[PDB]
Write an enzyme that holds these catalytic residues in place. Structure first.
Site: not given
Ligand SMILES: OC[C@H]1O[C@@H]2O[C@H]3[C@H](O)[C@@H](O)[C@@H](O[C@H]4[C@H](O)[C@@H](O)[C@@H](O[C@H]5[C@H](O)[C@@H](O)[C@@H](O[C@H]6[C@H](O)[C@@H](O)[C@@H](O[C@H]7[C@H](O)[C@@H](O)[C@@H](O[C@H]8[C@H](O)[C@@H](O)[C@@H](O[C@H]1[C@H](O)[C@H]2O)O[C@@H]8CO)O[C@@H]7CO)O[C@@H]6CO)O[C@@H]5CO)O[C@@H]4CO)O[C@@H]3CO
Ligand SMILES: [Ca+2]
Ligand SMILES: [Ca+2]
Length: 863
Positions: A451, A488
């Site tokens: 994790d 991860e």
């Molecule tokens: O908030 C905490 C969060 O915790 C859990 O999240 C886990 C997740 O489910 C796992 O998959 C993983 O996350 C990693 C992921 O898999 C990777 O791929 C990567 O992510 C990158 C993205 O793919 C890339 O596209 C970009 O992301 C940006 C978004 O595109 C942009 O929209 C923005 O996003 C914002 C959202 O639009 C907004 O809704 C808000 O999101 C909230 C979520 O809706 C809510 O579900 C929750 O998320 C939880 C989740 O449920 C758990 O499962 O809270 C969110 C609060 O933010 O905010 C978003 C932005 O803050 O921003 C992003 C960032 O630029 O880049 C990312 C690079 O990070 O990496 C992921 C981790 O970095 O693991 C996490 C557990 O850590």
């Protein structure tokens, strides 16, 4: 929260502080205010600065000024006191000096000999430590014995009669959060068993014969063969989900370890079917001692499932009933670590006594016996609790401020969830590796999923790898060479960009042989991302080909995005290698690392297929069936979405690298669109092995994590056409099994090296004129005389896989593959799916004809 502490005591003789005469104040009674000090010493500013050993370990303070501590200072005494430095006053973060002076590699926990039992506890800052022995799991304290300290380690040796006693440590230590020296009762960080809820540690010998099931010592001889890590497939499963609703399992075993010993159950018949088809590994969700679920079953609260079943499909009443009891029900994913080395009590038939140990072993043995190796979901990145109080806090109760990572102000880092650990600290690194060895040796665990691996130091991951590989069957009873590791590699927050040191991120773990989840192929297939708009479509959810109405640009944009996703998916299909060369959609040749995601990241990053975990679904986020039900046009029949589910799982199952399946992929499992069901109880996490339902349309998911998306969920949940019948569920399972059988019918699907993939794997539908919605993957084996490669397959000399997500039949002309003896795979020739059986190959033109929403595998026989 921990007080202000902007200074660091990094070595026996160096303090670091980012100030522009500095004095050190100590109080053994914690009686300072702003006065109240028992001792004070001036610190002479250091000219040279901080040593490389310090900056390598704590990169983030490399700019801090260095202050020398006089050698006349009794550091060992001081680290047990309340300390502040004055210039401006602030506390000090001690991990540096604690490691420098008290790093310990001797035995911790209990050591048994013929005539005695010894206890060892690492508590360098404690002023006193005693052990309290109790009258069983629930009785009063019977006896207190003082321990003696030597270089931060407290120990005592008692009679062999101490065996089977229950105990706790009484630790007298200064707690910054309370600004007082407190007397705390704490469990043993090196506990091997516990009473209910870990209220007490059980002084048991983990090696005792009575704690071993029959034939346990010979399990190595019964473990399923594993020729190569490249032969691994993984099935991710929650222990309670597995049997919570399985009526073929006795009520007394359901939801726990024992349910796996029931080979005649529907659940185990299900796993045996998957295992027989080729699945190699079962990844179980957290099964160590975590908080959030009472070990005492008679304290559990349940909802009435017969009642909730009567509520409307899109009502908010179901989640209201669950939420009302969710803090005291039997359910939790378990990502709330308290003690890493002990089985979870709630999953045992009896939380007190030997059952949790015996039944865990019975579980691994049972799974091994049906052809499945066991992977543990390990959570070393954070702790459930910190501070002096609570049954859920252990580590930070014994050595406050050490096991957890803190910011430059002294506040605890919470990015992982809460109470981040600091694997960069010596004794945290040790505890992690010791724990892994514990599960590998004492429980014969076959692999580990890490994790938030990006929160762990790489050097920890690498040492654990070397320690696990050193285990032999003759010396340790297990073949460590077959133990597989993955995690991860997410890079974010305070550890991002190597800020705390080289961490276990995706990029850093390239070339380590340790797998990481491929989020590129996941998002390219499903569309969007875990945080973006839920309606964003992907390669396999209708992007361009079948717009869902949600505006995502003109067709030119969506077609380009589709082609982009296609490139990313193909890099993933070839093991997500950084060096594999793909003809991109632009017609330009590019390495996997030169193809980028929308946010500028290298798509392919690994040095080997075994470093890639390809997935489209997992316990977190929406299930495969749910994500598809949300992103595809609402007009689609459930019959069409069923085919779409299979296409997704088939893309994983036929990819180079390591396929990862979420339990339920194979049976259209739904969580009623719950995106984070960690606390959503048995109701929203239901696994139905009668195959009568998939748990779709059981009410809106809990508002806490889902309310913002309720408006888009309600219409779909309420629509009868979205719900599959038994026939659909069984069909998906049958086709899932067939694709597994195909993967293991030929070694060509499971190439073990990057060189083999570069030489043998070709994609045949590329460039600016590529057919949208089609991926054609060819894999070559040695053929003819004087072959340029080795012969890997005795039955086939070439394999061609066509993924067609188009709603209609396609004909793919591959002239390079004309005049060959391709036939539809025998598994699919005999498929129960009538559609795939209409697939065809035409030698004269090398034309492959594949029906809509179908994955067809063609082979060239040798005979
Ligand atoms: O908030 C905490 C969060 O915790 C859990 O999240 C886990 C997740 O489910 C796992 O998959 C993983 O996350 C990693 C992921 O898999 C990777 O791929 C990567 O992510 C990158 C993205 O793919 C890339 O596209 C970009 O992301 C940006 C978004 O595109 C942009 O929209 C923005 O996003 C914002 C959202 O639009 C907004 O809704 C808000 O999101 C909230 C979520 O809706 C809510 O579900 C929750 O998320 C939880 C989740 O449920 C758990 O499962 O809270 C969110 C609060 O933010 O905010 C978003 C932005 O803050 O921003 C992003 C960032 O630029 O880049 C990312 C690079 O990070 O990496 C992921 C981790 O970095 O693991 C996490 C557990 O850590
Ligand atoms: Ca198997
Ligand atoms: Ca719960």
């Amino acid at each position: 929260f921990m007080p202000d502490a902007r200074a660091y005591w990094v070595t026996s003789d160096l303090i670091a502080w980012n100030v522009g005469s500095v004095c050190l104040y100590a109080s053994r009674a914690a009686a300072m205010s702003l006065q109240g000090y028992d001792s004070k010493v001036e610190l002479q500013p250091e000219s040279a600065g901080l040593p490389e050993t310090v900056t390598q370990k704590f990169p983030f303070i490399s700019s801090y000024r260095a202050f020398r501590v006089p050698s006349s200072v009794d550091v060992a005494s001081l680290v047990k006191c309340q300390l502040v430095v004055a210039s401006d006053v602030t506390g000090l973060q001690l991990p540096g000096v604690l490691d420098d002076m008290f790093a310990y590699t001797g035995p911790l926990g209990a050591v048994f000999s013929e005539d005695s039992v010894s206890l060892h506890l690492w508590a360098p800052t404690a002023q006193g430590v005693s052990v309290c022995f109790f009258d069983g799991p629930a009785g009063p304290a019977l006896e207190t014995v003082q321990l003696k300290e030597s270089n931060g380690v407290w120990s005592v040796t008692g009679p062999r009669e101490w065996e089977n006693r229950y105990y706790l440590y009484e630790v007298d230590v200064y707690h910054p959060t309370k600004a007082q020296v407190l007397k705390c009762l704490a469990g043993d960080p090196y506990a091997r068993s516990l009473s209910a809820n870990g209220a007490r540690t059980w002084l048991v010998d983990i090696n005792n014969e009575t704690l071993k099931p029959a034939s346990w010592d010979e399990l190595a001889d019964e473990k399923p063969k594993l020729d190569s890590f490249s032969d691994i497939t993984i099935y991710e499963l929650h222990i309670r989900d597995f049997s919570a609703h399985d009526g073929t399992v006795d009520s007394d075993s359901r939801g726990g370890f024992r349910a796996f010993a029931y080979q005649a159950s529907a659940g185990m018949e299900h796993l045996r079917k998957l295992s027989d088809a080729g699945l190699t590994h079962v990844h179980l969700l957290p099964s160590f001692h975590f908080a959030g679920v009472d070990d005492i079953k008679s304290n559990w609260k349940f909802v009435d499932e017969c009642e909730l079943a009567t509520f409307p499909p899109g009502s908010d009443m179901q989640q209201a009933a669950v939420v009302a009891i969710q803090e005291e029900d039997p359910y939790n994913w378990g990502y709330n670590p308290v003690l890493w080395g002990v089985p979870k009590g709630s999953y045992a038939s009896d939380p007190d006594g030997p059952s949790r140990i015996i039944e865990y072993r019975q579980m691994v043995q049972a799974l091994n016996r049906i052809g499945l190796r066991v992977v543990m979901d390990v959570v070393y990145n954070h702790l459930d609790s910190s501070g002096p109080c609570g049954i859920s806090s252990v580590l930070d109760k014994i050595v406050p401020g050490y096991y957890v990572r803190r910011d430059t102000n002294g506040q605890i880092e919470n990015s992982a969830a809460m109470n981040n650990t600091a694997s960069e600290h010596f004794m945290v690194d040790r505890l992690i590796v010791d724990d892994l060895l514990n599960w590998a040796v004492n429980y014969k665990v076959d692999g580990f999923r890490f994790d938030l691996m990006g929160h762990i130091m790489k050097r920890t991951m690498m040492r654990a790898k070397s320690a696990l590989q050193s285990l032999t069957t003759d010396a340790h009873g297990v073949d460590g060479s077959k133990i597989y590791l993955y995690g991860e590699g997410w890079d974010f927050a305070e550890v991002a960009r190597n800020q705390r040191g080289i961490n276990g991120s995706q990029l850093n773990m390239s070339g380590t042989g340790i797998g990481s989840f491929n989020d590129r192929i996941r998002d390219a297939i499903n569309g969007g991302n875990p945080f973006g708009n839920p309606l964003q479509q992907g390669f396999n959810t209708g992007l361009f080909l079948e717009p869902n109405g949600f505006y995502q640009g003109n067709e030119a944009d969506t077609r380009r995005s589709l082609a982009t996703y296609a490139d990313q998916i193909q890099i993933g299909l070839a093991g997500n290698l950084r060096d594999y060369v793909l003809i991109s959609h632009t017609g330009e040749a590019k390495k996997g690392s030169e193809i980028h995601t929308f946010d500028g990241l290298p798509v392919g990053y690994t040095a080997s297929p075994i470093e890639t975990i390809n997935y489209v679904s997992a316990h977190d986020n929406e299930t495969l069936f749910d994500v598809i039900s949300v992103k595809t046009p609402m007009i689609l029949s459930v019959d069409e979405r069923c085919r779409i589910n299979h296409l997704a799982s088939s893309m994983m199952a036929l990819s180079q690298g390591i396929p990862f399946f979420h339990a339920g992929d194979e049976i259209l499992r739904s969580k009623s669109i719950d995106r984070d069901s960690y606390n959503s109880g048995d109701w929203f996490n239901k696994l139905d092995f009668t195959y009568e339902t998939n748990n779709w349309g059981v009410g809106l998911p809990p508002s806490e994590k889902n309310e913002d998306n309720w408006p888009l969920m309600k219409p779909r949940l309420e629509n009868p056409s979205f719900k599959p019948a038994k026939g659909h569920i069984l069909a998906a399972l049958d086709s899932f099994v067939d694709i597994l059988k195909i993967r293991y019918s030929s070694p060509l699907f499971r190439l073990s090296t990057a060189n083999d993939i570069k030489q043998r794997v070709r994609f045949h539908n590329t460039g600016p004129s590529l057919v949208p919605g089609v991926i054609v993957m060819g894999i070559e084996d040695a053929r003819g005389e004087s072959p340029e490669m080795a012969q890997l397959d005795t039955n086939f000399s070439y394999v061609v896989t066509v993924f067609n997500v188009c709603p209609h039949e396609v004909s793919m002309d591959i002239p390079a593959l004309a005049s060959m003896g391709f036939e539809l795979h025998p598994v699919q020739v005999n498929s129960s799916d009538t559609l795939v059986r209409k697939s065809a190959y035409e030698a004269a033109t090398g034309r492959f004809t594949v029906p809509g929403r179908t994955v067809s595998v063609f082979v060239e026989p040798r005979c």
